[PDB]
Write a protein that binds this DNA or RNA. Structure first.
Ligand SMILES: [Mg+2]
Lengths: 466, 389
DNA sequence: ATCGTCAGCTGTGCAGTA
RNA sequence: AUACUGCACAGCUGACGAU
């Protein structure tokens, strides 16, 4: 048979103090973040109605004192939160100062719940919140990170036009990032329905996972220092990673292109910058032009030569769409203008109706690579011999890696190295991440950048996007 | 609050130590890293010269990866380098407020750096009267894929004829001959697997322009529109040589079975080698209360997508379910039921389907081979889990 | 400005957290 | 929007072939 199957191991993640482990949860609980925070204070401001603020304070007070696991069934799936003590997996503590806390009056919420027009009601709610946060920022009570805790009666009008995209677009002029929390997470008594008819209500996972995900996001947003990173091997050349995705305008059918840049820091650090430019559209097509790709590569090389005082040696570009001649010509022309000799161009396809089948009521392990005559089938979702079982039903779909014909490295090394780039994102802490962070970061940047008006400020800081 | 728990932990650990002697000083508030200096008592006289001890106290709560038998602790390399360069052995203890779990662990000073990842263990590692001198003497499975290698026949047929396909369909339904479904016309060219002139379908083709061409010439090329026409021809052929126990529905491209035996389920036993195909291929379900009203009679179908690899063509299988309420009418609502059944079935139902279909069902012009088999380097340890249905 | 053919990429929502 | 997987439904895109 002309099929060569590989089972890559789980990639390691380098935490602080030269410790590496495959689990972000236990790894953070063991060694803490990679880039430590010089200090001990993360100040939090809360915006919402009165009851949301009291439940937010109660939530912080409860989760600061340890959280039990879900059960003894598959313990690695549900590890207990250790709280913000001396066993804290952040080496810092969060406090909610009383000098800045925005309580929303019931008259304004009543006026919000009375407007029949859908657009301007969400717009005025977003603008009022933004004005409260701006007056928060202008004073001497600046917080490190803000929390928008929403009530139930606001949520019937806001949810039942997006709210997160509008708020994160209109909050990009501030000096701190914000985080949105629904009513259901803070209070376990009440629970809301959704858009379709609902006799029942929504359901979320238990408070162990909520605390881990929410507070890892809060720590990265507040401190500004990255929790973990991909562990670099010894011997390889210097490299710079780019990812490309697409999105829509929410009113028309026109498609845009997003981007994200990564390179290793000169030392122990990582860079997840965005791009302070709003690439425009050239038609409703999932393919970009060649000049904008050239400008992307020049910006990437300028950032690398600014940080490292030298050019890189390798460039990795990940794309959701298939590479074409024009984009490859532009990237190659930019690179040989700069003078780099190692290139790798890979298209990721998420719609391939081929799978690896076996008997035993369970699918194959995560990290299964099959060479389909120059292509690559990768099982980034699958069975896990660390979580106990495979979390989920039916089968996990695989993704296909299609390299360009100008890429130097073979399909197996590229597949392993893309498999090492998946579990990097700091929004989550689980392992079942089927999308590499050059793709997911570009998707997040594009999702936030949907509602940003023309002639506005676009920040390259990643904390304004997740 | 956490500042007093360390002091009381140090005090009660010292009380345990002073319980059987073990002269402990503690430190002042000027200390950093190593805690106070302790010794070992010998029946009422300090025979031991000196040793170093460090306190580590935590609140109520289990440790990392603690499941009834052990736990794990990690050591900072600054502290490890601090203790490695020293002149005295050190010991490390743990918390005391759940059930007073005073444990001892010692790091050695042998050749070679690196001593972290203290993995503590069972009841042979505790401070008690059981043993006290022990730390005082320091003076695969091959799987398959869902592909089907397809062996082509010898010759196809080509022609030239310029009628619209809508008129040709209306010609072939209103006629008297067999309902042949092997004809694809695109670009003005008549294509078929059977010979047009040896058929009743010759009415929509010219008699003098029928030619026989080799299969392998058009199987491989650089053009992809001809590949799309080839795949449509293969779909028409697969519809043709199976339309006796099924039909066609454009939703999910399903060849769902036709129920003509007056609401009888079909087990469809095959038993190819030892014992298989004992699962119900077609199932019958009645309503909640009344048997006069039928809820849904269900059966599963599939849809084939054809492709090429190194000039060898392949077919895919995506089996879907299909719920018919009362018969040949399309279902009023099937998304929640299809979602629920897909939520219910594990991976073995797909395995049972690929071992029961397209080798032993509707395979008894195109010859269908065995699905390809691959070697997996690591077998999934399914025997260790709970097997939670 | 319409209709079959194939091949793939974003929005929008529901279960289920095994 | 604490997060991810699976499923379902939609809209869109470039070469066909014809009015
Ligand atoms: Mg987020």
């Amino acid at each position: 048979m002309t099929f060569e199957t590989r089972i890559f191991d789980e990639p390691e993640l380098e935490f602080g103090d030269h410790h590496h482990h495959q689990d972000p949860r236990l790894g953070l609980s063991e060694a803490g973040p990679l880039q430590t925070f010089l200090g001990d204070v993360i100040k939090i401001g809360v915006v919402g109605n009165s009851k949301t603020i009291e439940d937010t304070r109660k939530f912080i007070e409860t989760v600061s004192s340890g959280v039990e696991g879900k059960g003894e069934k598959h313990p690695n799936m549900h590890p207990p939160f250790p709280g913000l003590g001396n066993q804290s997996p952040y080496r810092c503590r969060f406090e909610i100062e009383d000098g800045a806390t925005a309580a929303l009056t019931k008259s304004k919420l009543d006026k919000i719940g009375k407007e029949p027009d859908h657009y301007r009601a969400v717009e005025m709610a977003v603008d009022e919140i933004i004005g409260e946060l701006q007056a928060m920022d202008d004073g001497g009570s600046r917080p490190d990170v803000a929390i928008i805790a929403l009530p139930v009666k606001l949520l019937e009008r806001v949810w039942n036009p997006n709210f997160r995209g509008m708020l994160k677009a209109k909050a990009m002029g501030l000096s701190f990032p914000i985080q949105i929390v629904w009513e259901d997470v803070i209070d376990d008594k009440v629970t809301i329905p959704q858009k379709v008819k609902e006799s029942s209500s929504r359901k979320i996972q238990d408070i162990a996972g909520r605390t881990w995900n929410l507070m890892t996001s809060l720590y990265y947003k507040g401190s500004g220092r990255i929790p973990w990173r991909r562990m670099p091997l010894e011997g390889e050349f210097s490299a710079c990673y780019v990812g490309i995705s697409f999105y829509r305008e929410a009113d028309g059918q026109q498609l845009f292109t997003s981007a994200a840049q990564m390179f290793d820091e000169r030392g122990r650090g990582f860079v997840l910058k965005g791009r302070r430019a709003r690439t425009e559209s050239r038609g409703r097509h999932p393919y970009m032009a060649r000049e904008d790709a050239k400008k992307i590569i020049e910006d990437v090389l300028a950032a690398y030569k600014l940080h490292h005082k030298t050019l890189p040696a390798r460039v990795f570009i990940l794309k959701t769409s298939r590479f074409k001649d024009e984009e490859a010509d532009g990237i190659i022309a930019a690179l040989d203008e700069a003078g780099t000799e190692l290139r790798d161009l890979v298209w990721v396809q998420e719609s391939y109706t081929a799978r690896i089948l076996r008997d035993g009521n369970y699918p194959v392990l995560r990290g299964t690579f099959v060479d389909l005559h120059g292509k690559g089938l990768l099982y980034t979702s699958g069975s896990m011999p660390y979580y106990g079982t495979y979390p989920g039903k039916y089968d996990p779909n695989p993704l296909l890696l299609c390299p360009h014909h100008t890429s130097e490295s073979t399909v197996a090394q590229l597949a392993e190295e893309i498999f090492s780039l998946t579990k990097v994102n700091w929004n989550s802490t689980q392992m079942n991440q089927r999308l590499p962070i050059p793709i997911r970061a570009a998707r997040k940047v594009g999702e936030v950048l949907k509602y940003v008006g023309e002639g506005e400020v676009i920040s390259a800081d990643y904390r304004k996007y997740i | 609050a956490n500042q007093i728990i360390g002091e009381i932990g140090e005090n009660e650990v010292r009380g345990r130590f002073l319980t059987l002697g073990w002269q402990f000083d503690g430190r002042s508030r000027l200390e950093a890293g190593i805690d106070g200096i302790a010794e070992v008592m010998n029946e009422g006289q300090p025979m031991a010269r000196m040793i170093a001890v460090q306190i580590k106290s935590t609140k109520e709560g289990k440790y990392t990866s603690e499941s009834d038998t052990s736990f794990t602790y990690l050591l900072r390399t600054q502290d490890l380098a601090y203790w490695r360069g020293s002149n005295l052995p050190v010991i490390v203890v743990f918390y005391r407020q759940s059930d007073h779990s005073f444990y001892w662990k010692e790091v050695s000073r042998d050749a070679g750096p690196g001593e972290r990842r203290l993995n503590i263990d069972k009841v042979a590692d505790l401070f008690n009267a059981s043993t006290v001198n022990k730390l005082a003497a320091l003076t695969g499975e091959d799987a398959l894929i869902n592909m089907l290698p397809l062996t082509l026949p010898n010759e196809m047929y080509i022609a030239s004829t310029t009628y619209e396909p809508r008129k040709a369909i209306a010609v072939i339904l209103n006629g008297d001959g067999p309902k042949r479904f092997d004809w694809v016309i695109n670009g003005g060219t008549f294509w078929s697997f059977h010979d047009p002139r040896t058929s009743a379908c010759s009415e929509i083709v010219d008699i003098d322009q029928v030619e026989a061409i080799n299969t392998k010439e058009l199987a491989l090329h650089d053009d992809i529109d001809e590949q799309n026409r080839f795949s449509h021809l293969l779909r028409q052929t697969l519809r043709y040589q199976t339309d006796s126990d099924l039909g066609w529905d454009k939703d999910h491209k399903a060849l769902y079975f036709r129920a003509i035996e007056r609401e009888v389920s079909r087990n469809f036993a095959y038993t190819s080698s030892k014992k298989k195909t004992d699962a119900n291929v077609v199932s019958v379900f009645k309503n909640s209360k009344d048997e006069t009203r039928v809820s849904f009679v269900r059966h599963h179908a599939f849809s084939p997508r054809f492709e090429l690899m190194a000039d060898q063509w392949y077919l895919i299988i995506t089996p879907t379910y299909y719920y018919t309420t009362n018969g040949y009418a399309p279902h009023q609502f099937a998304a929640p039921l299809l979602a629920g059944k897909k939520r219910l079935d594990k991976s073995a139902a797909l395995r049972g389907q690929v071992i029961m279909w397209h080798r032993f069902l509707t395979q008894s012009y195109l010859m269908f081979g065995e699905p390809p088999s691959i070697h997996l380097d690591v077998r999934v340890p399914e025997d260790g889990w709970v097997k939670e249905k």
